[PDB]
Write a protein that binds this DNA or RNA. Structure first.
Ligand SMILES: [Zn+2]
Ligand SMILES: [Zn+2]
Ligand SMILES: [Zn+2]
Lengths: 48, 44, 1131, 66
RNA sequence: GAGGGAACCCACU
């Protein structure tokens, strides 16, 4: 998102990057919240 | 060293990094010799 | 001629011996796997649709005929070999057979004819093979051939070898499919609900469940709604009937209510008709259905297609899935609504979930079929992707490169290895523990684990009903054998003569019913349904019959002579409800019963005489089934039969309590399982003690298998001198307990001697123990392998050198030979190297990764085996042998739940003695008996005294009137002993007679696996965890004990605050941090340079030293990671 | 697995009696009469031979590694 | 003079 704001980019791709950053930060804090997919390790197990 | 073949009961010399195969019958499961060290059992 | 009552016991055990000579004990596993291999794999391949692919060129791929080979091994050379089960166990191979298939690829071009390519016998993966099944290499081999292959002939088979580990598929309970079950949901909006988990027969597909429910009173009236698959909202049932193609209320009520002269059914269907009056056309009803779908289409015609697809393909697949089969579906849905109204009226009883005729048992067959269905769908998906890619940009694709055999092979291997029944990426949302490592501590544990049933209800559930011993478990599930703790009642075991049905095609029964005067549902007016009998075949209402009694007589006659109807087909006449239900599907648990006609057994003396020469006449159990003498009755049919417990119930006078017996139990003691059948006199014990013995007979050390010298199991236990019991049951003749026994007949005196047997303890004779009494051997296997984890990394079996290897464990390495492996016959201790493996470090070019012996487990290297693994590296397995002499604290149990640790061992001159000089081998406390009421222990001791004096093996079959305590007492008094088993014992220390007379005699005891030397553990200081810096887990890692929360509460109540601080701070994890005196955050402290600096305050002098647990520092840093500021203030 | 040398309870020699006991049973003796002919009077010595399972015979049906 | 975690299963009081 630093790249997508340092050079020009569309509003929707910036919003999608914001959504992904929000998901990653929230799943760093809370990975068992309802309504969203669980953050998972590539083996398929969820993260702690 | 000397390994007994599991199937054909024969003893075979195997060096290190040599694949474990019986030179007679090509059986891949082989067993070590009983040791020559001296082991004492109390008869208890 | 009729069997006289004096010959009846001998005759019934003859027919039981014939049954176990034919079927054995693991017949359900082998039969399910054989059905899966022969029928289910081919059917799954057929039901998979052909692949149609267009960019244009059209390619049609059609999988036609499977081929399964015998289990073969391919080494890195590539030459196939017949792979033996011991080779699979030793080399950690998967005992699997390659599965080939015939594929046809047709090419359809524009302006060109169809082109056929016949890819015959195309390899698509490897199916793991159940041991001693049809496609196992041990099939049909005699006992001599099995011994020449280093296999135990007593080994049952019934398991798989996955990576060298023996895996058993535990049978899984489920609700029965295609059957209407009406329950009353509590504390819900529904007063009653009808449920049908509909699954189409002759195919492996998921079950679609429909809920025909009725709303509660609390609403002008109570209405019937339908919860359909792939429909979000509930739909009124009249709308579903209109969308099925019946718009008039008269036709819908004819499909629902069969007797129109019944007004209360009309009264209850009035609210549904009133609710769904606004829809009056089929298309409007389909629109209403499609408006509540998974994704409602914007086009109304798309909603019509979606609703039609739901109502045809996904609504009740078992009654019909093809086009124009809607009248059978309408009659079945009307039958569901009629059953709901019958439950609503109280005119029919609600269905029982715990009733075990409403349950099916998924054995290895159905479970492996579910797996293979999913994975063949995945393989076709990947073939479709590959061929799509090479027809999109290219023109042609190679089919042999299209198929990924890793899918089927590694999916079956993964699900059998882990027990997670599903996919590797979806392990969290799949059922676990379906596949378990096969218990090999005793032969009884092996048999019990091979005949194990499991309710897949979560063990955290605190409701009692699934755990309860249901009435319908008689003769099907052992009433004694259940685990203790969280899995009580949920994990069950098979009774000895219980057989789980394997499945059959309904087509012969359906044809016979079609031309045995049953009229179809399509060809009848509904007015004929009211007085006729509905006929269900695998839960499919196929027609009605006007004469149900002669129809059931004809069907029973056909099944009894093994005509059109096969023996495992269940046929139930619900006489009060006017229904005949015929079940041919798999998972129905049944048992054989003697047929009784007019208060007489059809088993005569001619059958018993023919069975006495089973290996001369070639008369077998199957001939007895074909004679119409015995027949298999399942739980649903057993609810309509009238069982005589014994033939004495038949030969009874003017008031026989019943003159209409239909069946007779072969022997009632056959209601027990494998582990409960070794209990002598189980009907003289309290039932929880029989449960405890059923638990502990799997922990008893004997000789678990005959070929234990070939096998290198991780844990193995072999008794020196296992004895068959002096007091046996007849059911033990088929558990092979006479050939692989677990225990010793012990002279047990029940006495209070020196106080060392109190509170479930035993005193053992030290002189007996010196003579080999209950001496055992512990075998432990250690596996290691060289592995090429990268090009530079190379683990190698070498004898290491101190000046060359990095990071040794300060141990001796001289006992290793120069191949890096210790030799057999060498004494080893806890700090000794047995496998010397070095890994190259990318002057210390390699570091030490040697395999060490487990600590405090002294022993002698019994065997060393060197081989090649699957991927061709050197693989060593070392069996170390240690002799376990009985010790204070070793667990011992009789066969009656009388567990106990050895409290002391006295020598022969210290033990009390009889006037003949007999000292007890074991002294147990009298107080173990009264609250337990294990009277079968006392009767076994008395019967064993009689047996050892007479020179015979005492019979302790449970329900036996020929054996009585008075008869055993008189027999004992005939041998010069007191009739009640008491003897005058003399004190060993003083020689004086004990004033009381001591009950003493032979009783079968078992040495349990729980030695004190496998449990004793102390830690002073040692290894700690990386994260929280607290001591480790378990004695195997030199860990500490948990001073848990309850211990913390207890030390709070004691008031010992300094002991609480010692345990929870400075015996676990002392730590020192430096915090700012202003902000309270942990500062940066350089103790070497004395630079105590706090960033965020520019503070270099107001820093304080705080002693805290390392876990509290970790907690505070985790909170700071969560943007919380825990500020430690020293003021 | 093999017959014990001693009776566990008293220490009477029973290891020289298993083949004699099998020969007596082959000679149509009852088990009690066969035990009585071998001098096993105490029932502790009689459970040695009565309850013995001779598993070594079936172990000898496997080809030896050594 | 001491270098993995996780998951699951069995068992013990
Ligand atoms: Zn060989
Ligand atoms: Zn600060
Ligand atoms: Zn004796």
């Amino acid at each position: 998102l630093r790249r997508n704001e340092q050079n020009g980019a569309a509003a929707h791709v910036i919003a999608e990057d914001v959504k992904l950053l929000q998901f990653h930060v929230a799943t760093m804090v809370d990975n068992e919240l309802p309504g969203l997919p669980r953050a998972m390790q590539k083996s398929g197990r969820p993260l702690k | 060293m000397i390994y007994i073949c599991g199937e054909c009961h024969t003893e075979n010399e195997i060096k290190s990094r040599d694949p474990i195969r019986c030179r007679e019958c090509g059986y891949r499961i082989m067993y070590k010799k009983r040791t020559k060290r001296l082991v004492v059992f109390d008869a208890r | 001629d009729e069997i006289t009552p004096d010959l009846w016991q001998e005759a019934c055990w003859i027919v039981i011996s014939s049954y176990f000579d034919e079927k054995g004990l693991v017949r359900q596993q082998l039969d399910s796997f054989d059905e899966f291999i022969q029928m289910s794999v081919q059917r799954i391949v057929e039901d998979a649709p052909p692949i149609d692919l267009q960019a244009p060129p059209r390619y049609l791929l059609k999988f036609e005929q499977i081929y399964l080979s015998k289990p073969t091994h391919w080494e890195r050379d590539g030459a196939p070999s017949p792979m033996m089960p011991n080779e699979a166990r030793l080399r950690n191979l998967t005992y699997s057979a390659p599965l080939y298939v015939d594929i046809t690829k047709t090419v359809i071009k524009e302006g060109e004819e169809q082109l056929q390519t016949q890819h015959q016998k195309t390899f698509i993966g490897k199916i793991p093979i159940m041991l001693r099944s049809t496609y196992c290499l041990l099939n049909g081999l005699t006992d001599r051939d099995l011994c020449e292959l280093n296999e135990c002939p007593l080994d049952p088979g019934g398991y798989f070898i996955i990576n060298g580990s023996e895996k058993v598929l535990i049978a899984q309970e489920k609700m029965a499919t295609n059957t209407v079950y009406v329950f009353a949901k509590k504390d819900s909006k529904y007063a009653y609900t009808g449920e049908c988990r509909s699954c189409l027969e002759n195919s492996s597909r998921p079950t679609s469940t429909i809920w025909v429910s009725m709303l509660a009173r609390g609403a002008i009236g109570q209405r019937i709604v339908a919860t359909l698959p792939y429909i979000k909202q509930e739909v009124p049932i009249i709308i579903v009937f209109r969308a099925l193609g019946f718009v008039s209320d008269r036709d819908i009520l004819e499909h629902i209510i069969y007797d129109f002269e019944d007004p209360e059914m009309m009264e209850m269907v009035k609210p549904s008709l009133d609710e769904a009056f606004v829809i009056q056309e089929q298309n409007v009803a389909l629109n209403f259905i499609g408006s509540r779908g998974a994704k409602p289409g914007v086009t109304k015609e798309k909603r019509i297609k979606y609703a039609k697809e739901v109502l045809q393909k996904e609504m009740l697949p078992h009654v019909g899935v093809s086009d124009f089969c809607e009248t059978k579906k309408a009659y079945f849905l009307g039958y569901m609504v009629h059953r709901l109204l019958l439950a609503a009226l109280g005119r029919r009883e609600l269905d029982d979930r715990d009733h075990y005729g409403n349950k099916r048992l998924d054995l290895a067959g159905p479970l492996l079929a579910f797996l293979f269905r999913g994975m063949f769908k995945n393989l076709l998906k990947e073939v479709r992707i590959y061929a799509q890619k090479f027809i999109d940009r290219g023109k042609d694709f190679n089919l042999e490169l299209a198929i990924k055999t890793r899918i089927i092979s590694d999916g079956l291997k993964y699900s059998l290895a882990t027990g997670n029944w599903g996919d590797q990426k979806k392990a969290h949302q799949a059922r676990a523990g379906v596949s378990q490592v096969l218990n090999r501590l005793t032969f009884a544990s092996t048999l019990s684990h091979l005949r194990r049933l499991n309710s897949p209800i979560g063990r955290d559930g605190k409701l009692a009903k699934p755990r309860q011993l249901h009435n319908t478990l008689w003769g099907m599930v052992c009433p004694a054998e259940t685990p203790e703790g969280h899995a009580v009642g949920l994990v069950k075991n098979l009774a000895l003569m219980a057989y789980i049905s394997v499945g059959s095609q309904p087509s012969p029964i359906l044809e016979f019913l079609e031309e045995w005067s049953m009229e179809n549902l399509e060809e009848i007016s509904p007015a004929a349904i009211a007085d006729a009998t509905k006929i269900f075949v695998n839960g499919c209402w196929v027609g009605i019959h006007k004469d149900p009694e002669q129809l059931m007589n004809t069907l029973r006659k056909l099944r009894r002579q093994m005509d059109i109807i096969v023996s495992e087909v269940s046929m139930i006449r619900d006489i009060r409800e006017r229904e005949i239900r015929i079940y041919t599907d798999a998972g129905r648990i049944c048992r054989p019963l003697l047929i009784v006609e007019k208060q007489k057994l059809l088993l005569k003396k001619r059958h018993i005489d023919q069975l006495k020469e089973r290996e001369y006449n070639n008369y077998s159990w199957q001939d007895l089934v074909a004679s119409g003498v015995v027949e298999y009755i399942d739980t649903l049919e057993e609810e309509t039969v009238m069982l005589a417990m014994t033939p004495d119930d038949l030969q009874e006078k003017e008031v026989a309590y019943c003159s209409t017996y239909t069946h007779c139990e072969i022997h009632p003691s056959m209601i027990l399982g494998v582990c409960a059948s070794i209990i002598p006199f189980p009907d003289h014990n309290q039932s929880p003690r029989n449960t405890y013995q059923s638990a502990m007979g799997k922990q008893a050390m004997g000789v678990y298998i005959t070929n234990f010298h070939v096998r290198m199991d991780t844990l193995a236990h072999v008794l020196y001198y296992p004895q068959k019991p002096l007091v046996t049951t007849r059911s033990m003749e088929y558990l092979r307990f006479r050939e692989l026994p677990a225990g010793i007949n012990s002279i047990v005196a029940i006495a209070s001697y020196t106080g060392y047997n109190q509170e479930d303890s035993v005193i053992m004779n030290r002189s007996a123990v010196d003579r080999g009494f209950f001496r055992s051997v512990f075998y432990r296997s250690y596996k290691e392998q060289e592995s090429k984890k990268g090009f530079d990394q190379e683990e190698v079996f070498e004898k290491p050198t101190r000046e060359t290897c990095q990071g040794m464990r300060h141990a001796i390495y001289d006992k290793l030979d120069d191949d890096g492996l210790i030799a057999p016959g060498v004494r080893v201790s806890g700090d000794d190297v047995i496998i010397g493996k070095t890994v190259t470090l990318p002057r210390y070019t390699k570091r030490d990764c040697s395999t060490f012996l487990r600590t405090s487990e002294t022993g002698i290297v019994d065997q060393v085996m060197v081989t090649l693994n699957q991927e061709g590296y050197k693989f060593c397995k070392i069996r170390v042998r240690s002799v376990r002499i009985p010790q204070i604290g070793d667990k011992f149990a009789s066969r009656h739940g009388q567990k106990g640790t050895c409290g002391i061992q006295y020598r022969q001159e210290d033990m009390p003695f009889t006037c003949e000089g007999i000292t007890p081998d074991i002294i147990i406390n009298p107080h173990a008996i009264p609250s337990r009421m294990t009277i079968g222990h006392l009767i076994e001791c008395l019967q064993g005294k009689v047996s050892a004096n007479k020179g015979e093996i005492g019979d302790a079959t449970p329900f036996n009137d020929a054996v009585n305590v008075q008869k055993i007492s008189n027999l004992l008094s005939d041998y010069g002993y007191h009739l009640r088993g008491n003897e005058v014992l003399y004190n060993g220390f003083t020689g004086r007679k004990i004033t009381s007379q001591i009950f003493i005699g032979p009783t079968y005891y078992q040495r349990l696996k729980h030695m004190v030397d496998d449990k004793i553990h102390s830690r002073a200081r040692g290894p700690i965890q990386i994260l929280n810096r607290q001591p480790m887990e378990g004695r195997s890692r030199d860990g500490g004990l948990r001073f848990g929360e309850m211990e913390r509460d207890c030390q709070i109540a004691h008031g010992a605050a300094q002991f609480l601080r010692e345990r929870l701070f400075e015996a676990s994890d002392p730590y020192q941090v430096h915090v700012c005196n202003l902000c309270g955050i942990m500062a940066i402290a350089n103790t070497r340079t004395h630079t105590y600096e706090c960033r965020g305050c520019r503070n270099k002098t107001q820093i304080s030293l705080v002693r805290m647990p390392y876990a509290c520092k970790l907690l505070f840093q985790e909170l700071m990671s969560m943007s919380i500021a825990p500020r430690m203030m020293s003021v | 697995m093999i017959i014990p040398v001693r009776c566990f309870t008293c220490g009477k020699i029973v290891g020289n009696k298993w083949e004699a006991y099998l020969g007596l049973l082959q000679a149509e003796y009852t088990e009690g009469d066969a035990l009585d002919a071998l001098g096993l009077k105490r029932y502790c010595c009689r459970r040695m031979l009565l309850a013995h399972v001779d598993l070594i015979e079936k172990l000898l049906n496997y080809a030896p590694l050594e």
